[PDB]
């Protein structure tokens, strides 16, 4: 999924990217790996991942190699 918007990242960006991922393919990834940004440590994203049985993984702060892909 690829999404583009002028606004700073927030739960809206995650919402749009996950909706695009579902639309293009049909299923969310089983283990979603996200960074320690405040937009991921929120209440909307966590319940959204919980609703669709998505294991959420959090890379340690200031360790970008965990998202090397």
């Amino acid at each position: 999924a690829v999404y583009l918007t002028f606004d700073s990242p927030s739960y809206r960006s995650c919402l749009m990217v996950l909706r695009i991922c579902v639309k293009r393919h049909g299923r969310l990834p089983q283990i979603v790996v996200v960074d320690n940004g405040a937009e991921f440590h929120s209440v909307y994203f966590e319940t959204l991942l919980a609703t669709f049985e998505c294991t959420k993984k959090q890379r340690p702060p200031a360790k970008a190699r965990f998202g090397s892909v």
Binding site: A38, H41, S42, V43, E46, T47, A50, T51, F52, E53
Partner: peptide, 15 residues
């Protein structure tokens, strides 16, 4: 602490 969601066990599965 700051902007930190309280520890909770959210329900899982589409209601």
């Amino acid at each position: 602490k700051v902007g930190k969601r309280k520890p909770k066990r959210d329900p899982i599965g589409v209601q």
